[PDB]
Amino acid sequence: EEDTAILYPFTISGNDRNGNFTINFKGTPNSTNNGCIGYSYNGDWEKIEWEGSCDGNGNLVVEVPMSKIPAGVTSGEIQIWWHSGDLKMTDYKALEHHHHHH
């Protein structure tokens, strides 16, 4: 699982579930891609799947409602699974956290 995916750990509030978890990916223009927002919940690893294509500028914005992550969850990993060309996460915003991946 971890070993074949490209990994981006995160932590969040256990309580606040307003808005979206928004993720910016940069990659080959017109590539197709998928992955998840994974997290631990009561000792299970749960996955919210995402998928999309990069546009002509190489950009892919993924939006996942925060409501999909159960209350009490405080940590996880954004993962890239399939990437037809190149893909990397550059940024995400969840709740009050504006994160840049250097």
Ligand SMILES: C[As](C)(=O)[O-]
């Ligand atoms: C605010 As930061 C250190 O997660 O880019």
